Design a protein around this ligand. Sequence first.
Ligand code: XXX
Length: 206
Amino acid sequence: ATFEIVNRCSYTVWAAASKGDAALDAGGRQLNSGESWTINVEPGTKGGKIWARTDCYFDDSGSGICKTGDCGGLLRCKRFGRPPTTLAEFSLNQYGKDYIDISNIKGFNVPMDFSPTTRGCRGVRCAADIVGQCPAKLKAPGGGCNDACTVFQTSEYCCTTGKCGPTEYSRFFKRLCPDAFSYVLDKPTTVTCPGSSNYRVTFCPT
Ligand SMILES: NC[C@H]1O[C@H](O[C@H]2[C@H](O)[C@@H](O)[C@H](N)C[C@@H]2N)[C@H](N)[C@@H](O)[C@@H]1O
């Protein structure tokens, strides 16, 4: 499957793509304002994620640091990134279907639209100003708005026992972006697309 990743933000981001134990395609790249990066993701990829990173510094060996979304100091991510990170999530070719969603379960750093470029399903978007409105206890100094699990590390916020409800903090994310997961047991906002669809991820879509 093809994913086109487009940075429409006025600032540079460093895109990342990983299925947790491995890079997807090159795994990461700098995207200046307006740049597009096209990657190929193997059919059958389960649990893939794409996100943006802000305020990164890398040396010539592709090693360094980012203020949001850092994946152990690497330009090319092999693993998932440190919150806060707005997440485009996907599982491809699962019994003939693709499943896509956007999630704020790991917080929010950059607004995002996640849309199919082929026929047969709709896209999802979280483009509200979550950072500007972020509750004070969730504000990350580096930028972005952390989820409550990352900040407080309780069973209720992390949904550790498999049982948990919504919270004042989850409802904040849900109010600004109803189409994104706001906590682990949120009512699914997953979208079902035809198997082997293609997609575009746009940072700062509006
Ligand atoms: N709070 C301190 C610890 O956890 C943080 O966040 C984790 C974060 O909890 C994971 O969900 C993420 N995938 C990686 C990230 N390292 C920090 N990134 C690390 O400093 C440390 O692992």
